[PDB]
Point group: C2
């Protein structure tokens, strides 16, 4: 329960936090994913009902490390509420550390 005991590994299992809602015929997924290179963020729908968000970064921090919680790697699987066009392509934007993915349901 100690804060120094909450590790990068712990955070990988819960990170990034994500909201998902339906709007105007799209499933919208918003993730707080601060501190990544946009080109190292991958999102894909596998099957018809599964969004996978993957990301990686290098973290190099000098000096003596007292806390190390920020995940170097991220892989978040999100079950969509229902099938999305088997091959419905997705759009994504990354701003202020927030990744927004829109997936057409149509």
């Amino acid at each position: 329960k100690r804060s120094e005991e909450l590790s990068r590994g712990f955070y990988e299992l819960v990170y990034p936090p994500v909201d998902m809602y339906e709007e105007g015929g799209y499933l919208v997924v918003v993730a707080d994913l601060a501190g990544f290179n946009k080109e190292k963020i991958k999102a894909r729908v596998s099957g018809q009902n599964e969004l996978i968000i993957e990301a990686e970064r290098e973290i190099t921090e000098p000096g003596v490390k007292y806390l190390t919680q920020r995940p170097k790697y991220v892989r978040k699987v999100i079950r969509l509420p229902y099938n999305v066009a088997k091959d419905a392509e997705i759009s994504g934007k990354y701003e202020n550390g927030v990744l927004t993915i829109r997936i057409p349901i149509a």
Copy 2:
């Protein structure tokens, strides 16, 4: 910190759960400064407040509105954040702390006493 919650459906991992662990922070000491780096995506810089209390506690606080029209399937992003970090060195009782916020990352440098 229970991993017991780690076994629930993602849907049951609520904003309140993430409030208790968010943001993740790295902290290290370099050259007489304590450096704190927080993943704090999607806030207004001016709604981010960091202050030292006593001589060895950093509190990082922030708030935002989240407007999400439509039926929600997942609601994990915290609207409120309050992270308390115990500093391993004492900090100038009367000193300033500078911060920068870029790509959702808050970096705070604090002079070591």
